[PDB]
Amino acid sequence: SGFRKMAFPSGKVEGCMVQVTCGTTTLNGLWLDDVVYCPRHVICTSEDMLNPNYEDLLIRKSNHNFLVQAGNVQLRVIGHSMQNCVLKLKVDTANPKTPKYKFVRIQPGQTFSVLACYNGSPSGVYQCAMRPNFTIKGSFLNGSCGSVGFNIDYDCVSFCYMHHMELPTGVHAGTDLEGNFYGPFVDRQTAQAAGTDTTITVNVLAWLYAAVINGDRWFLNRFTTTLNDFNLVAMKYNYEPLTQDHVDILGPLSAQTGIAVLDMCASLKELLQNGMNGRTILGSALLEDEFTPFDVVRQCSGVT
Amino acid sequence: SGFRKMAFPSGKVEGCMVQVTCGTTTLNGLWLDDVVYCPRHVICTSEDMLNPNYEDLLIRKSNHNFLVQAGNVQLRVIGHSMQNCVLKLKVDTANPKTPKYKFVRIQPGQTFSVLACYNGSPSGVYQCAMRPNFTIKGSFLNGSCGSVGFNIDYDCVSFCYMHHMELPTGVHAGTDLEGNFYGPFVDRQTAQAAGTDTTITVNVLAWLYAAVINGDRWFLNRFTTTLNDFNLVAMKYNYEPLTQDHVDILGPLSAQTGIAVLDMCASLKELLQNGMNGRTILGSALLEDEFTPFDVVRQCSGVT
């Protein structure tokens, strides 16, 4: 027992990290097969970032201007192309450490692990959620660009995020591996509005189920609610409206605990309306929304 | 910017995990060079665990009774010996993936990453602290025994923990890599008292410094305190007494922020006495003690 904010083991991703340098700029790249993927802003200088014309900036670059180093060894760049906000550098060597992988575009509210990197070297790993407003609240300093987010299903790594920037608000924005930003963001040093964020209701309910499984049950009450009534409370408290699709995904947890989803909704309603009264749930004094129902099942069953 | 509970990249440790089976029991082992280390209770059945005579139970076992499997391949066991609560199985093949490593015994209040494993396969990684009472609050199910805790300094892995058991209270106990338990615990299914735990004061102060660096500063006040006055408050609230050695380790953070350690102590005193008044610090509604001053510096400087 016990419930922790667990990241996937990062070994398969560590074997893909490389350093990419273009001119004066260095960031991280992801080497899979014979392609290295990195943020296209590796071609910008500080002056360029205020309003870069990426097409024109890339035309001044040749394959030999992109220095790709896999720790000790240098990769030979034989092609370059820009796809949305990513550059794809074709190298003459397939990464011997390429795991089975997929590129996926995750949905807001889904979770993933991030391997924070600097100069092509992994510094740490943490689990996070894609906010409903398509930002992530990460830990990324200058040079972390190109660090990736991923999930792992047995031996297959699904890459879902590449880090590109920190908004002036301190939250993070990035793309899928085809270079499409999550959210309205553009790769330009301009103030950019992140939409109104909300709490991921289905994840908070999943986490309350994890809490009951792991011994914390003080918040369970004698009440029930309906989706309509619960959603009036979700509205007041900036929680995502709960749908039958969310109730359905909570099915396995409801079955394992014997606590009907609407009954857990009534516990959540009372916690929203009354707070925690100075108590904790799974070591947290707030309602945690970074665990999906799949995360809770995986962690509670010991999947490898 | 941004501050997360970050674990070390686990790749170097994933390459050392193996499955160890003895009779009906399977758990994880750590293969380094030509030795596999695992909890000695791999030799016990359920009946044995109430009061095992490990010496007698080990005498009924031969090298061929220990099945060691490194994912796909079987290791040949050519020796076995018990050292404290660990078994050391000498194998005929050195692990080709053995990283540079050390065995260290960490101090209470220090942090480390855990690679949770089942059947020799890594499931996830999380960061945690060794409590002042020598327990850890982990995420470990049946079969996670043998999963290890570690820190990484560039290319060197310092292994500090091997998981052995879950106390009836749901907290976790284990050993260093020489098989010595942290704390008063014994590897027996008996109710065992974990001492009174305390909050790791130096870590909470380090985390308040991380909060100021990363933009959260509402808790800073116009006050100062002394070590004696602060320790009277630490006493009332079950915090570890602060010493000059702790003040000294906070030196770099005090220098970087310009906030004297005793002034941060006065902010901590007011937070202990008044609570958070429904506010958060680095996304937490409680005072976080799982980041050491070294962790905060490492994370804030981007060390790889």
Ligand SMILES: O=C(Cc1cccc(Cl)c1)Nn1cn[nH]c1=O
């Ligand atoms: O944000 C940037 C550079 C950048 C600035 C503006 C736009 C773009 Cl695409 C990139 N780096 N950065 C700084 N702290 N964290 C982090 O990721």
Ligand SMILES: O=C(Cc1cccc(Cl)c1)Nn1cn[nH]c1=O
């Ligand atoms: O605690 C044990 C077995 C055990 C029981 C009693 C003593 C000893 Cl040494 C081992 N496994 N376990 C169960 N949930 N988490 C976890 O680690």
